[PDB]
DNA sequence: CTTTAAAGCAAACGGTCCACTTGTGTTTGG
DNA sequence: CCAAACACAAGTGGACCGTAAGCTCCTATTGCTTTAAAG
RNA sequence: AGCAAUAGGAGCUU
């Protein structure tokens, strides 16, 4: 789920870059650096509210190196899942051992054992998809799916859900 | 929060010896790191002497943050402190 | 003086060292809040933005 | 508030002497013709005699000098010593001013009494050891520079400036401006490690040194002893 | 050997052969093992009986 | 920049928080349990895992890496192990404070003998300083010889009513005299019983005596598991090209392990009560002298050479210990020393530097667009001709030694690179004579390169140094950066020290022949 | 070998107010080192694998709050000996109170 | 690297079992304290954003930064482009399309109305604006914490919500 | 103020502080024979008021513990009836500046 | 019958701090 | 108002820790001996 | 592209 997060990023600037439009160069550096990164403690940083109007303040020269440090404080929006929270999605992949659903920036895959047993897979249908009597899961469908697991890998994270519970699955 | 407004700044208006020494060292390191030079470079190649010329012409772009014993501080640009 | 006894007493009482002294900053190899290290040097923006636009980062 | 390299021994001239010598050096009289300024030193000599709106300022100056005399004699230096280390050396300032502006030929001086008095008053209100509009700041600032103001007023007295040193207006402005700047240069810098400097300044003389004296006595003092030799 | 502490040190020294007089002096040297732990300047003093 | 890139941000230490290490955290930060005494496996090539040279503890070899962090000898800090003790033992550096807490508290129910009811202690609690509070509570609470169950209708404070012992110290054994009611039965207080009593102290009780709930818990002053330092702290050495003896700490840890195993050979079989005490006391003594081998009134843990063991405390104290011998002062690179000579023809702030020293010492000069021709001339000149250069540092830290490089003509200097050129004329160097009694005994001079291996000084500066030319030697320190060059030239320079603050008079004058000649 | 920059040399540099020169003598002209500390426990118990870019304080079960510090190697050795005598010196990079 | 107002969290001797997450039981982690702070350290109420406020904020920020880039001079598949980097564009495009596929409140007017009506724990406050529910049952079973508060009002609040819900 | 002759025994002395809200101080007659504030080495002490103490602390951006201190048992604090937290102002001779004002806080 | 490896075994004078001894005072209870 | 025993106050003996700075060279020692086991 | 430690003794300049 998306949270508005106050966060900072300390930076280092070479003396060669010490020109008259420096602060805007650092703003562009921040926008390139942070727009897309994952952190295990926050989630996923999709955008930044009021990107061009971040205040870099006054940087301090590090004694011995001559490079500037900036505590660029700003308020942004981050998206983090939590186990036991219900999140909607749309299926991306399909496979006999389960399917993938894109959640926020990520993609969630649900395993075969965690699926209502009235759902039956089909490798021969056109289009290929899970079926049932009165239940359908095809590409482009919506899935109100619960998260029951999230491993934190620094670059890309993955969440494994479960549609075995009531009020969940095809919608 | 801890910064002091430019009106109630009660420190000396004069650059001290330690501030001058450290400012010159830092500027010399900066110019020696291929930083742009604000003064007109005529003859000298030593980064420290270039830094001295810039300091005399009030063209060194640095700020001294003078910490008080209670943790608060005052900010003075080098160009507004008076150099002897 | 009394280095080991003082360190033991500091351990046994959970002393917090504020690292404002000279010797303490010396043994950690840091800049002492002394002489040239009694202040900080920031980067001024108001004076910098007067430079020619061609001396800029690319 | 001064850096310890910046002070030099100077005589405080209001301290020594008899009251008659004090009176003759410093007291001026406008109505009284003889005890006034010698006429042959100033342009405006004839305009001086008989005035009152100027004898008031002269009396205020003389009373300030008597206040300094009493203060130094009764509170600070009760035993009469008047040669003390102080900031900017004024003898050297005066002699440099004489050299630069060529004070020979005993020329008519264009330096009026009210301008002298107001110049010295403004100077005495321009020696900043502490800056701030607070009230304890003002009290500490005036306590800081009381002795140096006593020196500057004992030296730059109207009779002395006009007769003994014969400064004109240009030399006067130069002396005042130089006193401002050199006093501002005599101040200790924030960040000074006065403790290490003091420790070395005390310990080094110990390397060259029935009352107990020298190293054992200094050891008694520093190793605070419940009984001494 | 196992009681090197609490034993007198420097009782034997390498004979100084830098020059002849240095050898002659080293062969006639004397040492009072008072030790430097103690600032009593009295035993360091040239005394009348030294004549 | 000579450190390989790490992604964490670099910051400096603002606060140091001392405290004890709990057994839980000692076990937690460890990487391998240590139980086997014997150093090598069986004299058999990469010794026994779980011994004192486990590769998990870290690498001390140049061509081997740490099996815990996978880093070279340069970067690996070393890693701690742990070695569980069969019985708990006192920390040697806390026995007096263990005694004082034993005297203060109730040794049966773990409660302060007096409460806030008594106003003297009710105000002794009110000291903010832990040490003053502890002193003010111990000096009152030490004399009440019972844990009264009623605060002075019957209202119970929860106390017990057991009498208090008169604690005494005899070596490492804490005796406590119970004067019942005649014959006061004096019994030995073992570290384990005191540990059990100490675990019962409540957090607020703990606060009153002046300890801490998170950092210093009174039972952590009793050792139950012992950290094993990495081999970096106790490296081996080589005596004649094939032989090695372990450091004192290593043999001490081996002796402790032997003692531990002997303890574990008594509670498993017959032990007629005059061997359990002996062996447990052997463990106590080995552990004590592993930390402090200067304990009053007992023999010292000795080496088979007859010397005493170099304990950690002895490692830390004295002129030659860690603090004063390696932290307050230390040996430094880029320094020189030789006899000084006088030169009437030098300026006051000039020092004459021998050619050989001028070529041995060096200054790193960043390549820029104002000094590139001069630096390339220095690179071509080489490290055997003056003015030349000794090293070229690439923008990533790779050194190009110009001695062994046969093709010195084929080096082009890049911008931002660094050349460690020779010592040259007008370089500011710090110049110093011992003893340095005042700030003017060590001053910065401008260099002038000269033959004839002495240092040259103008004769008026020999007074602040207290130097003359009858054998004296003086030290020269070369600043290795621009900040230090500027600091030297703008604060320590000879012209700036002519007037001293000691007596607000000059210290340099005209001396020793110019004075006679001018007269 | 090198020359000893003893305590009185440090006193003279302190009197001169040359802080940068003193730091440079004692660090870059001598045993400068780099260590990693735990942002939670402040002990140098951080297991660092720089080529795999992975850090962990296993006591605190921490992999994200870890900081590096440049300190004298003699200071690191001092802290390790203190840890060997059960004393915990905790190096914290920010003030609390 | 990426840090926030959450600072020391220093090590007390004791641990806490109450550190695992369970979004059913109001356990979120030591980053979303019941009383947040701002970039000036001043105290400030926790923020738990529904899909509507967040969508409006992101659209606003993107169009503001586009007008800033343009010197002062319409679709999520285009509006997400303002970021830098292909991964950035992809993540913001997926997020924006997700917002426009489940945004029952497609305007600032109804977002303001629900803000007024709602202002109770901000978690469930936002989840009501995010999870359509017919009657009391879905709310009290999918969100099990509404039981032990004795201020429900779900019936009429949800009625007015689904009433204000625009067609699709 | 309870002026006594010979000794005040510690048993009696303990009742002195427990008699709030009144204040009891004691002096021995032998100590009072000479007034020590008239001594040349003893400069004039003037206890500050609460408002002036606050002004002093704010002017120097100070905490109470960062001031030079004076014991409540100091002969001039005892002579002045100083209670804990009260600050005296001490004007004294200064050979470098003429006049110097010192402030001490009571333990 | 000889060699190697591992384990065990000897005989200077000053001063801050801590509480046991020596001493004085209370205030219950008749 | 006065007798008393134990609550409460110092005086006193004898424990530890430290003793300028920097530098040079040379020289010796780095565990040893006895018993037991294996080839 | 890699030159042990600990001790004692004698010295140098203050
Ligand atoms: Mg000499
Ligand atoms: Zn009890
Ligand atoms: Zn940790």
mmCIF file of C-alpha atoms in Angstrom, chain I residues 18-103:
data_model
loop_
_atom_site.group_PDB
_atom_site.id
_atom_site.type_symbol
_atom_site.label_atom_id
_atom_site.label_comp_id
_atom_site.label_asym_id
_atom_site.label_seq_id
_atom_site.Cartn_x
_atom_site.Cartn_y
_atom_site.Cartn_z
ATOM 1 C CA UNK I 18 13.258 20.205 58.686
ATOM 2 C CA UNK I 19 11.469 23.362 59.916
ATOM 3 C CA UNK I 20 9.956 24.485 56.613
ATOM 4 C CA UNK I 21 8.692 26.881 55.440
ATOM 5 C CA UNK I 22 10.763 28.984 57.824
ATOM 6 C CA UNK I 23 14.550 29.114 57.445
ATOM 7 C CA UNK I 24 17.007 28.754 60.326
ATOM 8 C CA UNK I 25 20.658 29.720 59.958
ATOM 9 C CA UNK I 26 23.276 29.605 62.702
ATOM 10 C CA UNK I 27 26.535 31.468 63.203
ATOM 11 C CA UNK I 28 29.176 31.276 65.918
ATOM 12 C CA UNK I 29 30.058 34.516 67.698
ATOM 13 C CA UNK I 30 33.809 34.016 67.217
ATOM 14 C CA UNK I 31 33.274 33.918 63.446
ATOM 15 C CA UNK I 32 31.311 37.202 63.454
ATOM 16 C CA UNK I 33 33.939 39.311 65.227
ATOM 17 C CA UNK I 34 35.347 40.501 61.893
ATOM 18 C CA UNK I 35 33.028 41.392 59.016
ATOM 19 C CA UNK I 36 34.748 39.675 56.112
ATOM 20 C CA UNK I 37 33.009 41.642 53.352
ATOM 21 C CA UNK I 38 35.047 44.659 54.498
ATOM 22 C CA UNK I 39 38.295 42.809 53.760
ATOM 23 C CA UNK I 40 40.211 44.167 50.791
ATOM 24 C CA UNK I 41 40.467 40.735 49.159
ATOM 25 C CA UNK I 42 36.695 40.193 49.461
ATOM 26 C CA UNK I 43 34.885 42.065 46.661
ATOM 27 C CA UNK I 44 31.284 43.147 47.077
ATOM 28 C CA UNK I 45 28.739 40.354 46.618
ATOM 29 C CA UNK I 46 25.190 41.251 45.564
ATOM 30 C CA UNK I 47 22.575 38.509 45.314
ATOM 31 C CA UNK I 48 20.577 38.696 42.095
ATOM 32 C CA UNK I 49 16.797 38.584 41.936
ATOM 33 C CA UNK I 50 14.892 35.902 40.036
ATOM 34 C CA UNK I 51 14.227 38.119 37.029
ATOM 35 C CA UNK I 52 17.843 39.232 36.879
ATOM 36 C CA UNK I 53 19.031 35.624 37.179
ATOM 37 C CA UNK I 54 16.815 34.696 34.225
ATOM 38 C CA UNK I 55 18.231 37.662 32.311
ATOM 39 C CA UNK I 56 21.779 36.524 33.140
ATOM 40 C CA UNK I 57 21.097 32.983 31.960
ATOM 41 C CA UNK I 58 19.483 34.149 28.722
ATOM 42 C CA UNK I 59 22.174 36.732 27.912
ATOM 43 C CA UNK I 60 24.844 34.012 27.938
ATOM 44 C CA UNK I 61 22.586 31.267 26.509
ATOM 45 C CA UNK I 62 23.478 29.299 29.623
ATOM 46 C CA UNK I 63 22.184 26.531 31.821
ATOM 47 C CA UNK I 64 22.409 26.777 35.595
ATOM 48 C CA UNK I 65 25.030 24.027 35.785
ATOM 49 C CA UNK I 66 27.381 25.856 33.377
ATOM 50 C CA UNK I 67 28.113 28.740 35.729
ATOM 51 C CA UNK I 68 30.972 29.084 38.209
ATOM 52 C CA UNK I 69 29.693 27.988 41.561
ATOM 53 C CA UNK I 70 29.648 28.954 45.221
ATOM 54 C CA UNK I 71 28.990 26.651 48.162
ATOM 55 C CA UNK I 72 26.080 27.415 50.471
ATOM 56 C CA UNK I 73 28.675 27.051 53.247
ATOM 57 C CA UNK I 74 30.923 29.683 51.692
ATOM 58 C CA UNK I 75 31.590 32.376 54.330
ATOM 59 C CA UNK I 76 30.216 35.101 52.056
ATOM 60 C CA UNK I 77 27.261 32.970 50.944
ATOM 61 C CA UNK I 78 26.664 32.143 54.611
ATOM 62 C CA UNK I 79 26.976 35.846 55.449
ATOM 63 C CA UNK I 80 24.473 36.721 52.706
ATOM 64 C CA UNK I 81 21.895 34.014 53.424
ATOM 65 C CA UNK I 82 22.129 32.458 49.966
ATOM 66 C CA UNK I 83 19.721 29.643 49.147
ATOM 67 C CA UNK I 84 20.265 27.096 46.391
ATOM 68 C CA UNK I 85 19.920 28.486 42.888
ATOM 69 C CA UNK I 86 20.475 32.137 43.765
ATOM 70 C CA UNK I 87 23.226 33.948 41.862
ATOM 71 C CA UNK I 88 25.476 36.615 43.337
ATOM 72 C CA UNK I 89 27.172 39.286 41.240
ATOM 73 C CA UNK I 90 30.766 40.059 42.207
ATOM 74 C CA UNK I 91 32.379 43.269 40.937
ATOM 75 C CA UNK I 92 36.124 43.276 41.454
ATOM 76 C CA UNK I 93 39.393 44.964 40.581
ATOM 77 C CA UNK I 94 40.907 44.121 37.193
ATOM 78 C CA UNK I 95 44.450 45.156 36.346
ATOM 79 C CA UNK I 96 43.926 44.577 32.603
ATOM 80 C CA UNK I 97 40.489 46.185 32.220
ATOM 81 C CA UNK I 98 39.833 48.246 35.352
ATOM 82 C CA UNK I 99 36.526 46.644 36.298
ATOM 83 C CA UNK I 100 35.198 43.113 35.946
ATOM 84 C CA UNK I 101 31.826 41.659 36.938
ATOM 85 C CA UNK I 102 31.721 38.027 38.046
ATOM 86 C CA UNK I 103 28.709 35.817 38.706
#
